[PDB]
Each structure stands twice: as structure tokens, then as C-alpha cells.
Amino acid sequence: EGLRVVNLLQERNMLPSTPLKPPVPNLHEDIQKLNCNPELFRCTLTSIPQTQALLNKAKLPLGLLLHPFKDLVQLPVVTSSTIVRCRSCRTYINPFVSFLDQRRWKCNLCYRVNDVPEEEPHRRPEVQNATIEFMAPSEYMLRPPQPPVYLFVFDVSHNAVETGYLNSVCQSLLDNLDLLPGNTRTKIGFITFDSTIHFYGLQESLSQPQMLIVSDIEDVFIPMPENLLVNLNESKELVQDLLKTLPQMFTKTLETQSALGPALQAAFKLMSPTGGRMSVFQTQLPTLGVGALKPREEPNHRSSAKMTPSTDFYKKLALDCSGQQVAVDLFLLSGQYSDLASLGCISRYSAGSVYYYPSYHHQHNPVQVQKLQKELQRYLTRKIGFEAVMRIRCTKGLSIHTFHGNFFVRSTDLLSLPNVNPDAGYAVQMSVEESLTDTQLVSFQSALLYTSSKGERRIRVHTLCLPVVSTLNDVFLGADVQAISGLLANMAVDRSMTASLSDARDALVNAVIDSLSAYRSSVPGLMVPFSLRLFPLFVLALLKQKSFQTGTNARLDERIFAMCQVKNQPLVYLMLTTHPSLYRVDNLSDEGALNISDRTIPQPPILQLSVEKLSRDGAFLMDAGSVLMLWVGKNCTQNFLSQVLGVQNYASIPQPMTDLPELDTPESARIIAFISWLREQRPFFPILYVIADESPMKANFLQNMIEDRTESALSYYEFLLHIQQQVNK
């Protein structure tokens, strides 16, 4: 705990050695024990300001971050003959309602008194679980539950063939054909494209699949009514033969241009009748037909902050897909500029997601080869919901005014989600539209109506309850630094597109200035409350991240993909990416979670992201969420080299090292235990590379040392000094 005030200039070692836990809302003990899991639903201010004026004085953003479809340990599934909802605002009865007459419950979002249906009511599972899934009746569906439909669209130009991506993708599909979510209704299709659009018919009556080339790029059509989207269960053998033949078909191809637009138009027409998931694999700039994009010159470290899409074709097309319940996932494996700032729109507005593999090559880039394999494994095997809508309700007086994430905002704040995936994160900014003088508690309820991979309409509901406060201090005491950092990153992304990168960077700095200056004017050095002791650190890390960094050699698509992750990833992986956890791992010992039966799992202390915390005599592991990087010092001990790395000297550590060996040494067992523990805490398998050697020209390990100064940014101490100059100006 800590009501205490912190002077950031004398501490400077503010980062705790143990992982950061989310704040506990200051609620009654029995209210809080029912509260939603903060990994699924959390607020920037756990103590809600009573008025809009109090919120403005605090200079902190009010918003929610949510991970509604996250994989869960246990999920209570209610199959009641009726779903009990509020008669006025349609809020699902939740643990935070108020029972009075025992046959009447008071809605916690609009205060309307309702009647309890003849169906100890407070023991009902709907009132005992903040997270619950409902079986939906016929009124909750516009059409019969759609089947699972997976359409794969591959670029087969000369550049794409040279990357060799098509081989591992077809191999992953073969390995994971039985793990695709669905039942006997599952449908699957395939399209390749270069300058023309190629369909593939699959009939058991024919000796081999049939490649149907649509060459009319200005007027695409579906060449065959049946057998393009085939039943996976029936035509399993036909799909497997195609996945084995596809990588061999375009070996000697001279097609250099790519008609991505018309191919997505054809893929859209093929999926229009049913909806489903479209997996697009693109490797270069689209230069032929509708959706063509002009080349651009990459910026260097010298150009200032002088972003947006070059066209609205992919945005319009994405909206057409959304109307037919089609989500589009984009896999960009480009070696040159491809205008991701325009291509990303196909996934933003269709509730898809983008995946970036810069300079992918089957021979030359083994790290991107293994990264694609691991991301595809998760992408093909994770659960999936189809034709999904999400609504989010909050207590009267609170109003959502800005949505963040991949979806399409329908009227009345309905979020259209053609697909919903368990790895997607969302953010919302709200304001106090009416003063909360009435209540002392406000609630927030997200509802996700979707069709499962088995053809069952389901509603997943999460309810969060927070208290209302009326003093500036109580607002600051309840601030969630990580949630505030996450919401600000989503706001700065929008600011980049709306204004410029300069304005985005300034508003991020101004949020720290305005927050602590307001705190100062309500109490020498730089004084912050305990809850905000990491606020300048995380914002500095935000400004050095690839999304907002300036004087770097960062390229256009890299920055856009970094912003696509801010808008689409859950909070925890935004924090892992922005401020990775750094550990020393050459001297591990068992003070660890040695409880797990037979495993010891060391728990080395988290280190501040600075080269000063490093050491040429040891080895350090950096958990950036999606990747683990093990830097080895030039003067590392012979024990670590031989017993962990399996190498006799620092000079013979292989240049790209894709993973540690599992040697028969206790030192190896300790480090494999610590790495395995890190990975079990997430589902996209993070590749570990120890290749970070003092000279592998791949030591971007140092780019995450966000506390150190560079030639084009401040240090953490310099940053603190600039904040204090502006706080008491």
C-alpha cells in the first residue's frame, strides 16, 4: 500500500522487482470479491470522478480496456429458458444489482425496478459471476447460425515466390487441418493471385483440382457455383493434395505485378453469401488494378515528424466485408515498402488483425520463418466466434464517446465484429455526462453476442463495478498507471492520423505535465502520488517505442504495424512490448516458485531498462511479450557458456541461435524452467533468440533500454528534469 508522496528525483529506482499487479477498487469486501477479472475488464480510474469538472482537474483520461473473448480457465454457462434483463436499458442481471423485495431487483445501470421471473434468487449464477456466457434464443439471431468458413488468399507474384512463405503456410495448414475450429459444417477455400485471380475447384469426380483464372481485373466474378468453398470434412483428401501441390506451381513464375484489390474483391464475392474468415497473404506493394498504391521513399533519421492511408479503397472494401460478416486478416511479409497504412484498413474495419514479417525469406531470415510458424499455429487453432456484435453499457451519467480497436462502430454504439478472436484487445474513452451525485457505485457491462464454431449463438457478458469519489486525491489514489498508459497510446495513434506525429508526441508529454502539475497545485522536487510513480517512465517508453519514436531509421510499415498493435493488443502485451521485463539469468537460484510439484522455476528480480543494469560478465533475458532475447556478455563465465549454451567460448556461439539447448546440467534446467514459465503465461509462443551478441548487428536489444539517452531522445533522468521544469513553470 501507500498513500505516501514520492519524489521521482531522489528515488529513480521506482520500478518494483516483482510484476505489477492491477489496482484493487476501493469497494466493500463483499462487492470486490465478485468483481470482474481485471485481465478481462479494467478502468483507467478505479475511483470514478463524480463530475466532469473533477475529471478535467485531474488531467487523466477516463476509459476502459477490455479483453472480452480471452481464453478462460472456467466459464459459467447459463442455458436458462429466459435471459433476465432490465426492462428499460436491457442490462443483463449481474452480481451488482440490488435486491429489495426479493421478488424485485433494482438495475445498477438505470435504477429501474424490475420483477424477478418465476424461473433465494441471489444464489442464481447470473448474480454470482461477473463473467458468464448465455445461450441465446431465436430473437438473438438474424439467420441460422452460419457455418465456419475459412478462405485463404495467397500472393504468388515473383517476389512472393522468392520469399518462400507459401511453403510453410501450406505446411501449417496441413498440420492443423483437423484443429481448425468447427464441426461437419466447416467450409474451406483457396485463392492465389498475381496479375490475374486464380480460383481452385475441388471435386472427388476429377483427377486433380482445377485452377480457374479470372483475368478480367476490372470485372471480377465467381467462375463456378459449387466446389470452390468445399466441405472440409468430406473433401479432406482434396484439400490436402492442393496444399501439397500449391508451393510447386509458381516456381518459374515471371509475374512481377500484384492485383491485390481485385483479388480481395473476388474473395469478397466468394464469401458474401455466408461470411467467415479471410486470410490474406501479401508480400509487396499492390500495383495493378483497383487498390493500386503509389511507391514512397522511406524516411531516415534526418527527416523530422512531417501516416494516413493513401486511398479509401481498402477501407470501403472492409466495410462491405463487415456487412456480410466477413473478417479479413492481413499477413504482410514484405521486403520493401508496401503502404501498410492503406492496406491495414482491410483489417481495422472488418474486425480482423494484421501480422507483419519484415523481410521474410525462407533461407535468409530464419527468425521470421519461426515467428510466422508460431503465430500461424496460434492463429489456426485458437477459438473463434463468427458474425459477432458487441454492446457495452455503463451506469447512467457515464457516456462512451470514442472507441478503439478493430471493428465497425454501428449506430447507437453497437460494435460490429465479423469475427471475434481471443487475442483482440479493445479500449474506450468515456466522460461524465451527468454528475454522479446520486450513486456511490457505477457499473460497466460488455456483452458479446456471437456464433460459435459449433453453430450455437452465445452471449459472453462481463460486469465491472467501481466506486465514485469526489476529491482530487481520491481520483489520484485510484489511478491505474498501466491502463492510463494504454489508453493514451490508443489516443496518440488517432492523434497521429488526425493531426501529426508531432502533436501525438506532444499530447503524450502534456498528459504527464498536466497530471502532475494539477497534483502539484493541490499539495521543490518532482512530487507524484504513489500510484503514478511510473507514469513518466511508461510515457517515456511510449515515446521511444517504434510507434512514436523520432530520430530513428524506422521505416513506414514498421511504424504503422506498431500502431496496429497498440490498437489491437490487450493491455498486458502493450506493456510487455513498450516496457519489456529484463532479468539477469546467468546466476539463477531457487527462491523461485518451487511449489509446482517437481519444478523449481527461479524468480530473478525485474531490472530497470538501462545498460547500466547490464554486465559484460553475465547474460540477460528480455521478455518483450512476443519475443525473448538473451543477451550474452563478452566476458561471460565459462560455466554459462558450456553448461547453458553448450559452447566452449564466446567466439563459437552461433550467429543466429534459434533457442537454447536442453543440456544435462542443473544450470540448464534452471534457465529452461524460467523460460518455460514465462511462455506458459501467454498463448502466442514467444521465440527466443540468444543471437544478441555484442556484435551480431542485430543488437536492437539496446533499443529497449528506454531509460538511457540516445542521440535523438532524452534519458529517463533528462525526461524527469524536463517534466519538473514545466510543472512549476
Binding site: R391, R410, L414
Partner: peptide, 5 residues
């Protein structure tokens, strides 16, 4: 688009 959710 309108929905019951």
C-alpha cells in the same frame, strides 16, 4: 444495423 444484444 440494429441488434438485440
Amino acid at each position: 444495423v440494429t441488434s438485440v444484444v
